[PDB]
RNA sequence: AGAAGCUGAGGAGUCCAGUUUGACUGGAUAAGGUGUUCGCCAUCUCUAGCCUCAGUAAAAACUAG
DNA sequence: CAAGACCAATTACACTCTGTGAGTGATGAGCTAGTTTTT
């Protein structure tokens, strides 16, 4: 349920995007430092998602004031589950109210809503930005969204 | 990168300014004779003759020295790997958009700032005896004492091969400051030459407020840059920049799309429609592309009609090839980043097929 | 050497100030957490002095957006050493320029400088500020003073 | 309170407005429809919506399937 | 108009004083050259 991982100006990455993920993705190469840095980036992102105090990652170059991490999650199946008029659970409503609602919901005509979910797939993008003063900014200013993700 | 006298003589001034170093001769400045002025609208451009040693020395300076100086990632122009598509790509994640423009950019770049920016990468040593330093010798190949603007010192011209790299180098500081401010405010910032694009993913009116404009103006005032208020754009959920439409109708992690409006593709559609109507190539060349045989400059006395027909055919060939290269550059950008509308992909595929068919037809008719 | 250590809104310290340090100082008490927190504060301050990437300290209460650590150094003996005409080495000149030069240009040489040459003592105050976004601010905006201290 | 426009000089036919019985001035063909944050915006459909002269320097991306 | 915010990268004493920080087949052949942005 993850499709894109993008790292810009962090550790050994200038602008690196990983896409078209499979089930049994394998990583090979002589650059062990690159694999270690990718693992560190993923671990740092998931630690900041859980609101843990960790040392910020180092910039690839100091002539840039922004270090960015982009994570794109494929939320098609969970959207189909929550948007079904058969499971009115507490957690399902929490997921629907947290990630979904607004945006493409109640902000357009009914015809767009009816044809919104026929065969398309939905993506959720989350951005972590590290500043020069060791400050972390998020694309969405809602801790509940990050915790749910 | 740091340069010395040996590096300057053996790499930069390999033969052009070789007589000056040996015979204790200071590097001359750029005279009015070797620079010609070209007028376009209210803009002027300075062209340096190829025979002048300054042109060669600045070409080698751009090739060996200016390319190794680190820049800021927000500068998407005049850089290897930089493009307008990469200038528009980062803003697909934003819901609000704000486009600003600086005033005359190369005219407002002070020469003192250029000297300060290039000082760390050039050794502080004298070149021609105890007369002229290496800083002045290198800087005399990049500036020009303009005969206008009341002669207010050396000014970076708008038509030299060394101007854009030096502009990016001297604007690296301002790029860092603006990027830091936007990161504190949670705004994605990109710059192409002098056009600044800001994108806000959050549902806030920061980009539509006067505070953002005031902060950008205050930051630019450090180096004397102003903001062109005539080209201020501040929109929500959609923006159109020179025919490039960025659309994002949503919030809380919504992926935007980048396409081209029908106005951008109107000229090529007209050309294809005219070709489908068997219109003579003279009308298309003289109207749609604005290419003519100026004052019958045929020089040689020969079969002028055949040469005219060949020119009006191959120039159309070049135009079609260039526009198909542009379109396939766009689709390659889409394949690399996946931020282009699928419907627009279908439309450009159809346009590419039509252009290929037309160019095959016209080559067959040749 | 050192005169005062002030901790505000960090760990278990609210407005704690320590002063009047002797050659030997004995720390006793049934609250070991307080001693540990004071040691952590001192170590964090000295690590930030040397520019080490460390996790910022926790606030005493989240209803305060600022956490201060104030250190006062008795710069009287070193000032006398560097002011003397006999000592004119590189390190002495560096110390004079980075600490005892900003405060000297603001004082008249005919009267104020003559009056300050007495038994009176001079102090140097340095404050470390921790913000809500894990950002560190300093009273002096130059690493040279912090490194020399 | 100075920034901005603006590649420049033009020409033929036609229309509108003004003065005026007789000529001049200002505008001006990317056409039409729809929605708009009203913008030189976006989108859809054709038969694609004048001509001549002068000028055109620089750096980057792009020659795919 | 005028403006806070002005990039990043560029180990250590010292002296007389050894403790102190200071008073002491060689010139007829003849030719050309994309899109877009900045501007």
Cβ of residue C83 lies below 7 Å from strand E: yes
Nearby residues of C70 by Cβ (< 8 Å), 6 or more positions away: C4, C5, C6, C7, C8, C125, C126, C127, C128
* Nearest-angstrom CA–CA distance, B290 and B110: 37
- CA atom of B288 to C1′ atom of D52, Å: 16
* Nearest-angstrom CA–CA distance, B338 and C69: 49
* Phi, psi for residue B31 in degrees, rounded to 5: -85, 165
Q: Considering all nucleic acid strands, name the nucleotide whose C1' atom is nearest to the C-alpha of residue B235.
A: D37
User: Which of C132, C125, C130 lies closest to C146 in space, CA to CA?
Assistant: C125
What string of H, E and C letters represents the secondary structure of chain B?
CCECHHHHHHHHCCCCCHHHHHCCCCCCCCCHHHEEEEEECCEEEEEECCCCHHHHHHHHHHHHCHHHCCCCCCECCCCCCCCHHHHHHHHHHCCEEEEEEECCHHHHCCHHHHHHHHCCCECCCEEECCCEEHHHHHHCCCCECCCCCCCCCCECCCCCCCHHHHHHHHHHHHHHHHHHHHHHHCCEEEEECCEEEEEECCCCCCCCCHHHHHHHHHHHCCCCCCECHHHCEEEECEEEECCEEEECCCCCCCCCEEEECCCCCHHHHHHHHHHHCCCCHHHHHHHHCCCCCHHHCCCCCCCHHHHHHHHHHHHHHHHHHHHHHHHHHHHHHHHHHCCECHHHHHHHHHHHHHHHHHHHHHHHHC
Two structure tokens written together for C93: 């000149």
Collapsing DSSP to helix, strand or coil, C148 comes out as helix
Q: CB distance C55–A55 less than 8 Å?
A: yes
Dihedral sign computed on CA atoms, order A93, A99, A103, A104: negative
Nearest residue in A to C56, CA atom: A53
Nearby residues of A124 by Cβ (< 8 Å), 6 or more positions away: A72, A73, A75, A99, A149, B252, B253
Two structure tokens written together for B133: 């330093």
Lateral strand order in the sheet of A13-18 = A13-18, A2-10, A67-74, A123-130, A136-138
Check: CB of residue B351 under 8 Å from CB of residue B264.
no
Q: CB distance C136–A133 less than 8 Å?
A: yes
Q: CB distance B73–A9 less than 8 Å?
A: yes
* Phi, psi for residue C22 in degrees, rounded to 5: -100, -175
Check: CB of residue B49 under 8 Å from CB of residue B38.
no
CA angle, corner C148, sides to C144 and C149, nearest 5?
115
Q: Can you give the resolution of this entry in Å?
A: 3.1
Bridge partners (DSSP) listed for residue B259: B245
Radius of gyration of the CA atoms of chain B, in A: 25
User: Which of A50, A21, A48, A6 lies closest to A136 in space, CA to CA?
Assistant: A48
Q: CB distance B73–A8 less than 8 Å?
A: yes
Instruction: State whether residue B121 sits within 8 Å of chain A by CB.
Output: no
Bridge partners (DSSP) listed for residue B353: none
Specify burial of residue B297 (Cβ count, 10 A radius: 0-12, 13-18, 19+): exposed
Two structure tokens written together for C79: 């000032």
Q: Considering all nucleic acid strands, name the nucleotide whose C1' atom is nearest to the C-alpha of residue B324.
A: E35
Check: CB of residue B193 under 8 Å from CB of residue B142.
no
* Nearest-angstrom CA–CA distance, B35 and B100: 32
Two structure tokens written together for B316: 């159309």
* Phi, psi for residue B22 in degrees, rounded to 5: -70, -50
Per DSSP, C147 falls in state: H
Q: Which residue's C-alpha is at the least distance from the C1' of E8?
A: A63
Residue with tokens 């964090």: C44
Check: CB of residue B156 under 8 Å from CB of residue B42.
no
Q: CB distance C55–A56 less than 8 Å?
A: no
Specify burial of residue A33 (Cβ count, 10 A radius: 0-12, 13-18, 19+): exposed
Contacts of A54 in chain C (CB under 8 A): 55
Does C64 carry a binding-site annotation? no
- Rounded to the nearest 10 degrees, the angle between the axes of helix B342-365 and helix B304-337 is 160
| Neighbors of chain A by Cβ distance (3+ pairs < 8 Å) | B, C
User: Which of B177, B195, B24 lies closest to B103 in space, CA to CA?
Assistant: B195
Give the DSSP H or E segment for A14: strand A13-18
Q: CB distance B255–A123 less than 8 Å?
A: yes
CA angle, corner B217, sides to B78 and B219, nearest 5?
75
* Nearest-angstrom CA–CA distance, B258 and B167: 28
Collapsing DSSP to helix, strand or coil, C123 comes out as strand
Residue-wise DSSP of A33-77: HHHHHHHHHHHHHHHHHTT---PPPPPS-TT-S-EEEEEEEE-HH
- Tell how strand A2-10 and strand A67-74 pair up: antiparallel
Instruction: State whether residue A117 sits within 8 Å of chain B by CB.
Output: no
Collapsing DSSP to helix, strand or coil, C72 comes out as strand
User: What is the least distance, in Å, from the CA of C35 to any CA of chain A?
Assistant: 23
Nearby residues of B294 by Cβ (< 8 Å), 6 or more positions away: none
User: Which of B283, B274, B281, B279 lies closest to B318 in space, CA to CA?
Assistant: B281
Q: How many CB atoms lie within 10 A of CB B236?
A: 17
Two structure tokens written together for C35: 């001693």
Nearby residues of A101 by Cβ (< 8 Å), 6 or more positions away: none
Nearby residues of B33 by Cβ (< 8 Å), 6 or more positions away: none
Q: Which nucleotides of E are covered by protein (CB under 7 A)?
A: 2-10, 12-17, 21-23, 29-39
Nearby residues of C127 by Cβ (< 8 Å), 6 or more positions away: C68, C69, C70, C71, C138, C139
Per DSSP, C50 falls in state: T
Two structure tokens written together for B362: 């016209």
- CA atom of C81 to C1′ atom of E20, Å: 9
Q: How were these coordinates obtained?
A: cryo-EM
* Nearest-angstrom CA–CA distance, B214 and B222: 13
Q: Considering all nucleic acid strands, name the nucleotide whose C1' atom is nearest to the C-alpha of residue C92.
A: E13
Q: Considering all nucleic acid strands, name the nucleotide whose C1' atom is nearest to the C-alpha of residue B329.
A: D62
Contacts of A139 in chain B (CB under 8 A): 93, 186, 201-202, 253
Residue with tokens 């549902």: B203
To 10 degrees, the CA torsion angle through B179, B182, B188, B194? -50
Q: How many CB atoms lie within 10 A of CB A16?
A: 17
Instruction: State whether residue B338 sits within 8 Å of chain A by CB.
Output: yes
* Nearest-angstrom CA–CA distance, C95 and B158: 48
Contacts of B71 in chain A (CB under 8 A): 63
Bridge partners (DSSP) listed for residue C16: C7
Bridge partners (DSSP) listed for residue B44: B39
* Nearest-angstrom CA–CA distance, A7 and A36: 14
Nearest residue in C to A56, CA atom: C53
Q: CB distance A127–B93 less than 8 Å?
A: yes
* Nearest-angstrom CA–CA distance, A87 and B164: 60
Does C36 carry a binding-site annotation? yes
Does A89 carry a binding-site annotation? no
């Amino acid at each position: 349920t993850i499709e894109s991982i993008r790292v810009k100006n962090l550790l050994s990455f200038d602008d690196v995007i990983l896409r078209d993920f499979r089930d049994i993705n394998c990583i090979i190469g002589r650059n062990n430092v690159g694999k270690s840095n990718l693992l560190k980036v993923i671990r740092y992102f998931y630690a900041k998602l859980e609101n843990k105090k960790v040392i910020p990652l180092d910039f690839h170059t100091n002539y840039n004031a922004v270090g960015e991490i982009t994570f794109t999650f494929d939320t098609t199946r969970i959207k189909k589950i929550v948007t079904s008029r058969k499971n009115n659970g507490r957690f399902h409503k929490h997921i629907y109210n947290t990630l979904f609602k607004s945006s493409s919901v109640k902000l357009n005509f009914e015809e767009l809503i009816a044809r919104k979910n026929s065969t398309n797939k939905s993506f959720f993008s989350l951005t972590l930005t590290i500043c020069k003063d060791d400050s972390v900014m998020w694309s969405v200013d809602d801790p509940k969204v990050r915790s749910l993700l | 990168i740091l340069v010395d006298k040996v590096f300057y003589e053996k790499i930069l001034s390999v033969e052009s300014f070789k007589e000056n170093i040996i015979t204790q001769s200071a590097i001359p400045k750029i005279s009015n004779k070797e620079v010609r002025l070209i007028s376009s609208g209210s803009k002027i451009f300075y062209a340096i003759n190829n025979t002048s040693p300054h042109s060669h020395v600045q070409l080698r300076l751009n090739r060996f020295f200016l390319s190794h100086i680190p820049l800021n990632s927000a500068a998407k122009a005049f850089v290897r790997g930089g493009s307008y598509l990469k200038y528009l790509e980062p803003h697909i994640y934003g819901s609000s958009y704000c486009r600003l423009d600086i005033s005359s950019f190369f005219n407002n770049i002070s020469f003192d700032d250029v000297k300060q920016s290039l000082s760390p990468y050039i050794k502080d040593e004298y070149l021609i005896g105890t007369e002229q330093k290496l800083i002045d010798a290198i800087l005399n190949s990049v500036g020009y004492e303009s005969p206008i603007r009341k002669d207010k010192g050396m000014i970076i011209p708008m038509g030299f091969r060394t101007s854009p790299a030096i502009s990016n180098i001297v604007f690296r500081k301002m790029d860092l400051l603006i990027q830091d401010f936007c990161a504190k405010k949670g705004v994605i910032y990109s710059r192409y030459a002098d056009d600044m694009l800001f994108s806000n993913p959050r549902e806030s009116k920061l980009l539509m407020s006067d505070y953002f404009i005031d902060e950008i103006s205050s930051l630019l005032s450090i180096m004397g840059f102003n903001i062109n208020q005539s080209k201020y754009i501040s929109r929500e959920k959609e923006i159109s920049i020179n025919g490039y439409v960025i659309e994002n109708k949503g919030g809380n992690g919504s992926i935007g799309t980048i396409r081209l409006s029908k106005s951008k593709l109107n000229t090529v559609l007209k050309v294809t429609h005219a070709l489908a109507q068997n219109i003579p190539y003279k009308n298309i060349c003289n109207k749609y592309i604005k290419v003519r045989l100026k004052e019958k400059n045929i020089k040689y006395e020969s079969k002028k009609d055949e040469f005219e027909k060949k020119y009006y055919r191959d120039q159309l060939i070049n135009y079609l090839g260039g526009y198909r290269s542009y379109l396939i550059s766009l689709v390659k950008f889409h394949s690399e980043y996946k931020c282009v509308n699928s419907d627009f992909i279908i439309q450009i595929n159809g346009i590419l097929n039509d252009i290929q068919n037309h160019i095959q037809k016209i080559k067959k008719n040749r």
